[PDB]
């Protein structure tokens, strides 16, 4: 607003307005509405008296002597002197108040005013104020309106149009700058008033009640603050408060730290969505059959490649569920498979008939009814929702074995990344080299199998959920792969049955039952599969040095739930790839900086440099670049699969201890104040998660190594 006034008008007029206001002891920086009003006043005044002159014969002319004389731009004494001189020389009568301009051709004092409101009202106010018929009045409006006595407008149409248009453009610019409203508001009759915002009524009492103890009124507090000067208040307070309020540095030197204590209890149980290291896949090396591509056709063809369907029987019971209903679900799945096989008209999707076993398996209608508390307030059994402490558990070795099997390679390639533009720049070529090396490093790793399997599972689940709103859809768990012979192989891990998919929010859950084939025996580690139901569904011949040995082929059935957000997070698992690379490339680049040359080949093909990437009874184990590549990829993929709040809490509260110990290693003489508090905060995060307990064990091992 003030900046707009300074920029839009001639700077000299700004100076005149500043002087005129300063005559009254005002600062424009505190009041700008008056400043803008005065600037507009001076601008319109000087516009009125411009380009007018008196000819030789006395007639008016446009370009001698100025026909109009300005009085408003001058001081009080100067303006009064000039008006008196005009009165004496031309014998004019003294107006009761100081005019703005003097017209020589008609010899009369004309007052001029620019009004933000209607013209007529301002005309009436001016007439009532002056109370004299010897002064002409000319009122302009920013909107394009004007008025004067008898409509005897002194100027010609051209000059009136110029003034109208200048004011109109000023109004448009003020409006477009978001200041027109305040400008129009500040005009009150014939004066411009400062913006007012005073605390009265409710806020007065509230402020009286929101002050320090030794004050009673907001005004008293303001007076105290205004008159305050810094005289050793802080020094006196420090000299008063007891020494017990202090931050003491506790030395931290090679002996203080201790391992993190894991929670005691029974061994922890698997909780992954799907089987990871115990899965079995029915394979077709080349799907070259009719109607290929549809998941149902591929699933059926994979099914037909296996024989050994024997009568299933509960092996590891669902301790909480109803095992015979799971058995009946599997039997219905098989029967529907045979039926569709003999139909000979396999459609794109298969919808399962609703049944007692299906409805119970997917948790259909097993939910307490909602009632008003007052209606059932007399129930003795009524009690707040159970939200007690989760059962502490113990780290079980199955997690370590799963991770170890995750960070190892496979027989085929589990990634088919898409194409990019041809490399031209040399850096593009180096990037292609590095990307291809990393891809070959982890194009077959197990974690990549997990990524592809989960991606396909969740994609099919969500697509069926949207397409089949109120049907039970049978979704085979299928994956594609490239064998060492370079053949498009298809693998069937199992089947999934989805319940009601009338999903509206991103957190409400759809319940499904997943039946994954397997070759492990749950009875070996029952606590691992305490959420699963296992049916020995067949026998499979496995080849070994002693020929073909028959083994029992199991089928883990479980009931799970997935939310839209969880399905999306499942389909995002491929991003895990990037994470791994982003941690190795930096290292590569780092060494390049210290060597001033590329190091992709001397790292991805030297196979001599190593990093400590594990533990063994002999000591610490060192691994090559590929070992670290797949280790980090597996860690990222598992973090995706075993995400839990306790994981992030422990990570955040353990980073601090990591940094403290590292600072000690760098000989920086670290110190701490309440280290036991940090230990307690870290320990609070270890309750039940297998992943978090494993990470805690890893940190204990690392601390043990680093301390020595």
């Amino acid at each position: 607003m003030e900046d707009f006034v300074r920029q839009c008008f001639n700077p000299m007029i700004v100076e005149l307005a500043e002087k005129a206001m300063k005559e009254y002891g005002e600062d424009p920086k505190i009041e700008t509405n008056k400043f803008a009003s005065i600037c507009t006043h001076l601008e319109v005044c000087f516009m009125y008296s411009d380009f007018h002159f008196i000819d030789e014969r006395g007639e008016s002319t446009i370009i001698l002597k100025h026909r109009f004389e300005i009085i408003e731009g001058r001081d009080r004494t100067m303006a009064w002197t000039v008006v008196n001189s005009i009165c004496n020389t031309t014998g004019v009568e003294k107006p009761k108040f100081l005019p703005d301009l003097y017209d020589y051709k008609e010899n009369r004092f004309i007052e001029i005013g620019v009004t933000r409101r209607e013209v007529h009202i301002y005309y009436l106010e001016k007439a009532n104020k002056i109370k004299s018929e010897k002064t002409h009045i000319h009122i302009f409006s920013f909107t394009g309106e004007e008025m004067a006595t008898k409509a005897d407008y002194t100027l010609d149409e051209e000059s009136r149009a110029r003034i109208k248009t200048r004011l109109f453009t000023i109004r448009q610019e003020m409006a477009s700058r978001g200041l027109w409203d305040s400008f129009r508001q500040s005009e009150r009759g014939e004066e411009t008033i400062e913006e007012r915002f005073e605390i009265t009524g409710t806020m007065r009492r509230l402020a009286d009640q929101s002050l320090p103890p030794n004050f009673s009124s907001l005004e008293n507090f303001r007076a105290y603050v205004d008159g305050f000067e810094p005289n050793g208040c802080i020094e006196g307070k420090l000299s008063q408060m007891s020494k017990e309020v202090n931050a003491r540095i506790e030395p931290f030197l090679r002996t203080t730290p201790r391992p993190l204590r894991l929670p005691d209890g029974p061994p922890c149980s698997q909780r992954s969505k799907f089987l990871l290291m115990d899965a079995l896949k029915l394979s077709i090396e080349d799907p070259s059959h009719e109607g290929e591509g549809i998941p149902l056709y591929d699933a059926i063809k994979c099914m037909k490649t296996f024989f050994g369907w024997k009568e299933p029987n509960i092996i590891k019971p669902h301790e909480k569920g109803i095992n015979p209903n799971y058995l009946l679900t599997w039997k219905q799945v098989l029967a529907e498979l045979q039926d569709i096989k003999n139909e000979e008209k396999i459609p794109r999707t298969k919808n399962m008939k609703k049944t007692s076993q299906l409805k119970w398996a997917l948790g259909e209608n097993m939910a307490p009814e909602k009632v008003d508390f007052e209606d059932c307030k007399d129930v003795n059994d009524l009690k707040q929702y159970d939200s007690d402490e989760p059962e502490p558990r113990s780290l079980a070795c199955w997690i370590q074995s799963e991770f170890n099997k995750a960070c190892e390679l496979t027989d085929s390639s589990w990634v088919e990344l898409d194409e990019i533009g041809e490399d031209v720049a040399p850096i593009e070529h180096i990037a292609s080299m590095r990307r291809n090396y990393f891809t070959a490093e982890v194009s077959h790793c197990r974690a990549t199998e997990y990524i592809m399997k989960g991606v396909y599972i969740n994609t099919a689940l969500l697509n069926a959920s949207c397409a089949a709103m109120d049907d039970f859809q049978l979704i085979p768990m299928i994956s594609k792969c490239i064998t060492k012979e370079g053949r498009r192989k298809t693998n069937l891990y199992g089947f999934i049955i989805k319940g009601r998919s009338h999903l509206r929010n991103d957190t409400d859950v759809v319940n499904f039952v997943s039946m994954e084939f397997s070759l492990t025996d749950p009875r070996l580690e029952p606590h691992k599969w305490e959420k699963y139901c296992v049916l020995e569904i067949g026998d499979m011949l496995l080849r070994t040095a002693v020929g073909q040995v028959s083994r029992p082929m199991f089928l883990y059935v479980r009931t799970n739930g997935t939310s839209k957000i969880k399905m999306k997070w499942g389909m995002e698992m491929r991003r895990c790839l990037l994470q791994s690379l982003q941690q190795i490339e930096s290292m590569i680049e780092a060494e390049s900086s210290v060597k001033e040359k590329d190091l992709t080949k001397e790292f991805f093909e030297n196979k001599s440099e190593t990093w400590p990437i594990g533990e063994s009874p002999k000591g610490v184990e060192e691994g090559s670049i590929g070992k670290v590549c797949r280790t980090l990829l597996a860690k990222s993929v598992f973090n995706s699969l075993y995400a839990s709040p306790q994981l992030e809490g422990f990570s955040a509260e353990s980073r601090k201890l990591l940094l403290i110990v590292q600072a000690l290693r760098d000989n920086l003489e670290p110190g701490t104040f309440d280290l036991e508090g940090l230990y307690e905060a870290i320990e609070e995060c270890l309750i039940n998660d297998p992943w978090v307990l494993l990470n805690a064990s890893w940190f204990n091992s690392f601390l043990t190594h680093a301390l020595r």
Partner: protein, 597 residues
């Protein structure tokens, strides 16, 4: 018709009528922000879900007449449905692909013209040249840099005006119809886009993108030109670098140098003048730089120099609370100091009247080839740090810093007279003379300045008096960083006072800028629908209102009613007197200026 009937329907209801009649067009955009819908959180998940549906794409009613209901395979392209809130029929991606493969065809002659920016990027890439990569430690100094080459560097307001005249011919505001400078670019674009069926909003946005300037704070390690920023990803890395050159056309202007020279001349010729303030103001108001008045350039260009800063202070504006001393932009960061006047006798028996800062102040200096920090006590140099590409930059920066310190130690280290006089034969102030003298030779001062040992640590090295790296010994509070120092992150603009002598004084009574600090170097200077005046509100006698596009038929001086702005009918006329709004108030300006003084 549809529009007026819909307006009648809206007027029928009480509330819609009340909102129509109450709210003024000024506040229209305020009632455009009152949306009762709900923004979709996580739109990626929503899109994934939507794509699975049968008809997730919304098309318009007319599609029913061009795209048949089903294709050869009897797939359903569009469905007889409507969207939630409008009459947008529902169609599938099949409809889009069918339109692409079998829809009616036209000529995209204007697409390159509307989209000149993107095609310019294409051309710049297509003609580039590459070079061998180099692997080494990279230092990316952070600074502000252009974004889009090909811009006219117009102010947002000017770009909006140009767009409004180009694509909205008969809806232009009052400022244009009361304007004289019909920019050449506007007519060029109007000729270019004669018959363009592209959506006018798209054309407006593209012109805005093409004609506006944009600046971003980035870490760069090489070329800073606009065409060198659009490929910063391809050019600079954390451990590598890429040799590249765009192969298009550069549009490096020179108006900045012209403004430098103009301001320098104005200050040099007004400092000796009787009334420098009013004189310089009159000059700046009546001077033209390549066909444009200098006031617009001063208000627009973000130049930083002593002459232009003093010009702003005289005219009245905000300038950085810092001074560019010895070719380096300075900036206070911490501490406070008080200015005290004193007389100092040098080593050449020369008495100089100086003003020294007493206090524990800290400054950061950014030069053309170096970056430095300086902590100074009361007439005591405490700490000095510098980093520069070359040794000569290091030396000049350190010389500037030490002369700024104004310590007593160097006073006795002055050898030779200090009688330097600028090209105008005006006596130079003592600090500038000392700066030039120490530029000429400072070996004697280096020998007698101060020498002390320094502990060895990573990232920083010492300097011996002969300006050579050292790890075991350096000069008092003098050190050099092996890694580049990031420039100042922000600048503080505060109200300042200017005296008739063109000296800018801070609110605390200290002086900020002086003409003597200005370098004296010399350079080389590298159916128009306008002219209408309104006549108040609409007048019925003159006849039915006309559209702006048809104003051209008006006779000389004939007055009619036309709709300007977004629906404001006003009475306008053609001009008869060949003048403009610029010369108004000038005569009365000078008259009242004489009266006040």
């Amino acid at each position: 018709m549809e529009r007026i009937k819909e307006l009648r329907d809206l007027m029928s209801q009480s509330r819609t009528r009340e909102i129509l009649t109450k709210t003024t067009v000024d506040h229209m955009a305020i009632i455009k922000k009152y949306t009762s819908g709900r923004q979709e959180k996580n739109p990626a998940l929503r899109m994934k879900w939507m794509m699975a549906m049968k008809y997730p794409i919304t098309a318009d009613k007319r599609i029913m007449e061009m795209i048949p209901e089903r294709n050869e395979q009897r797939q359903t392209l569009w469905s007889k449905t409507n969207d939630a809130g409008s009459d947008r029929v529902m169609v599938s991606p099949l409809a889009v692909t069918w339109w692409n493969r079998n829809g009616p065809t036209t000529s995209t002659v204007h697409y390159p013209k509307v989209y000149k920016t993107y095609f310019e990027k294409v051309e710049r890439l297509k003609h580039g040249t590459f070079g061998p990569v180099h692997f080494r430690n990279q230092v990316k100094i952070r600074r502000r840099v252009d974004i889009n080459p090909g811009h006219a560097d117009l102010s947002a307001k000017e770009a909006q005006d140009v767009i409004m005249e180009v694509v909205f011919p008969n809806e232009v505001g009052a400022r244009i119809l009361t304007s004289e400078s019909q920019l050449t670019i506007t007519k060029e674009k109007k000729k270019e886009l004669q018959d363009c069926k592209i959506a006018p909003l798209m054309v407006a946005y593209m012109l805005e993108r093409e004609l506006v300037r944009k600046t971003r704070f980035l870490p760069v390690a090489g070329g800073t030109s606009s065409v060198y920023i659009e490929v910063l990803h391809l050019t600079q890395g954390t451990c590598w670098e890429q040799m590249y050159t765009p192969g298009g056309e550069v549009r490096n202007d020179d108006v900045d140098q012209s403004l430098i020279i103009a301001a320098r001349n104005i200050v040099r010729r007004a400092t000796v003048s009787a009334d420098p303030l009013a004189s310089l103001l009159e000059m700046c108001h009546s001077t033209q730089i390549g066909g444009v008045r200098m006031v617009d350039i001063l208000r627009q260009n973000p130049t930083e120099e002593q002459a232009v800063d003093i010009c702003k202070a005289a005219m009245g504006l905000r300038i950085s609370s810092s001074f560019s001393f010895g070719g380096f932009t300075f900036k206070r960061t911490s501490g406070s100091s008080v200015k005290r006047e004193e007389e100092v006798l040098t080593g050449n028996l020369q008495t100089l009247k100086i003003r020294v800062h007493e206090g524990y102040e800290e400054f950061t200096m950014v030069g053309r080839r170096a970056t430095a920090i300086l902590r100074k006590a009361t007439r005591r140099l405490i700490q000095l740090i510098v980093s520069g590409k070359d040794e000569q930059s290091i030396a000049e920066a350190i010389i500037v810093a030490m002369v700024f310190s104004q310590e007593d130690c160097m006073i006795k280290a002055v050898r030779g007279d200090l009688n330097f006089v600028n090209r105008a034969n005006q006596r130079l102030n003592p600090m500038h003379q000392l700066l030039r003298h120490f530029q000429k030779d400072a070996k004697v001062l280096f020998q007698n300045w101060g020498i002390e040992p320094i502990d060895n640590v990573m990232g920083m090295i010492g300097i011996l008096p002969d300006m050579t790296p050292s790890t075991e010994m350096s000069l008092r509070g003098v050190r050099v960083s092996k890694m580049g120092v990031d420039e100042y992150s922000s600048t503080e603009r505060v109200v300042v006072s200017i005296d008739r002598f063109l000296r800018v004084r801070d609110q605390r009574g200290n002086v900020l800028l002086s003409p003597e600090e200005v370098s004296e170097t010399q350079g080389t200077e590298k159916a128009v629908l306008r002219g209408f005046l309104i006549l108040g509100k609409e007048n019925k006698r003159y006849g039915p209102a006309l559209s702006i596009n048809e104003l051209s038929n008006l006779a000389k001086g004939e007055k009619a009613n036309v709709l300007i702005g977004q629906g404001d009918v006003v009475l306008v006329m053609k001009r008869k007197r060949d003048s403009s709004i610029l010369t108004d108030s000038q005569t009365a300006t000078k008259r009242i200026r004489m009266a006040i003084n």
